[PDB]
Symmetry: C2
Subunit: 306 residues, 2 copies
């Protein structure tokens, strides 16, 4: 449970009010004071309105800024005031589907380092406003090779990234990478970077951020391959999930009924088998599951069943 | 040079007034009179405000409806008024970039029927508000089979669509169909559709709308494959274009600088090599070229050149 200060008391603030009350009712936080450039009143919702200058007069776990656009600038004034970035939250993330401050802060205080075969992880981190505490951003690795990696992680994480393809834009060729050497070599298909070198840079830099104390492992398996799914369901990893087109007896398997529905009924649908699009589109993911609950490693995070 | 009656005179009308003046300046049209249920005034911009029961006293080739929200309704009463459905136009298309009435109507009067290896045609027709006068919608054909098709079009069109693969949503497998036999068989891959039946029905029903008198052949060759590009450039079709990652000495090719730019520079880019996504995104396509001039098969439809 935390103590917080709120910077910004306008539209976003009153718009996020009910959620704030709810979060307080759950006992996840309490508002100490309200920071505001312009002073509309000396007390807003029974809370003293103070200046950035008198912030030092309060004890607090976070500053939650409620100002969509001007956020960045306030974050600076925050930093310029000696407040460590660690205690500055965007507040707009309060408007996320199944928000819960305690789960949201948990993932922040014990950095969730997501690991995915595709871009999912990167997207999820953005949707929540988390920082990329993982090297799995902007690239995908085929199932066959991927399962191999999750079974012998540290090893591969020690191997230097070795170009496998340089990539050329005039042949729509993307820079590919390699990790491993024998018939047990792995391939990373970077599809965001221009040149391999640039990709390698990002890789071995972000790599250093892995937080083995809070790892979330996700994998997507489009086709029928109970072999893999069983194999995945067997990884030691305590916190892991696998997206599948159909329900499975394997506990780590997901399956979103709504997906199948879209595949054969959604009119303006885009495809009839793009499960990886469904899982990467927060508009759909949030309807199918409670992301925050899921990432926190809780159970019953799938919102739609049977 | 058509004579048209306007049915709107509101926000969209005033919004589009300048466009009108311009279309008029080019001599593409003239406004005989204005139709309105609300009698704001007797004269708007020098033209008279009549009622939907008097349109019958005017000679005109088109009725331009300026009212997005209730467009369909107006059309229904216009049709109810016994007006040829072909003479009804939706004024909101006056708002696409590089709009020209002469061209727009040309593609109406002689139904343009786009043949394409992917969803491109479907998306384009919709961007212009044209009906699908082609069976090439929501499915793709690989280069090798697609070029094969384009060279022996009539034979294939005369074939019966056979199932090559029942689709199964529980393994992300899509329905696939085929035309021809032995070495002359080609494969269609159905995205949007969930069942081959549904697909075949769409195909069968739509293939009867092909209008040989106004074909537009489009193809997208992403990789380095000059043999194929050359073959495409040699097709008889007087109106065709091939989307390619680099410029070529072949006139049928269309290279878009901004694309390569987006690849190596655009921040929020999804991929570093998705010419398909680019070409099918009317927002990017409209910048790199003039869709109307292109469709009207006029040389010079490329806006940005290197």
């Amino acid at each position: 449970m935390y103590k917080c200060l709120i910077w910004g008391v306008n539209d976003e603030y009153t718009l996020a009010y009910d959620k704030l009350l709810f979060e307080i009712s759950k006992g996840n936080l309490s508002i100490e004071a309200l920071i505001s450039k312009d002073k509309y009143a000396k007390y807003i919702d029974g809370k003293e309105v103070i200046d950035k200058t008198e912030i030092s007069n309060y004890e607090f776990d976070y500053i939650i800024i409620f100002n969509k656009e001007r956020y960045s600038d306030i974050k600076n004034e925050a930093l310029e005031l000696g407040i460590p970035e660690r205690k500055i939250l965007n507040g707009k993330f309060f408007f996320i589907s199944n928000f819960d401050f305690k789960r949201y802060c948990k993932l922040i205080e014990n950095p969730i380092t997501i690991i995915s075969d595709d871009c999912w992880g990167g997207l999820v981190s953005s949707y929540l406003g988390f920082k990329f505490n993982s090297p799995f951003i902007n690239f995908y690795i085929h199932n066959d090779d991927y399962i191999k990696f999750l079974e012998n992680m540290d090893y591969y994480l020690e191997q230097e990234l070795k170009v496998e393809q340089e990539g050329n834009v005039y042949s729509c060729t993307m820079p590919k990478g390699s990790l491993g050497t024998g018939d047990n070599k792995i391939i990373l298909n970077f599809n965001h970077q221009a040149s391999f070198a640039e990709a390698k840079n990002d890789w071995d830099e972000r790599k250093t951020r892995i937080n083995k104390k809070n790892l979330f492992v996700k994998m997507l398996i489009k086709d029928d391959n109970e072999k893999l799914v069983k194999r995945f369901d067997n990884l030691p990893y305590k916190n892991k999930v696998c997206f599948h087109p159909k329900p499975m007896k394997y506990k780590s398997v997901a399956f979103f009924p709504r997906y199948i529905w879209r595949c054969i009924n959604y009119a303006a649908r885009t495809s009839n088998s793009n499960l990886e699009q469904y899982t990467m589109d927060m508009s759909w993911l949030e309807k199918s599951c409670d992301i925050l609950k899921m990432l926190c490693g809780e159970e019953d995070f799938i919102r739609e069943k049977x």
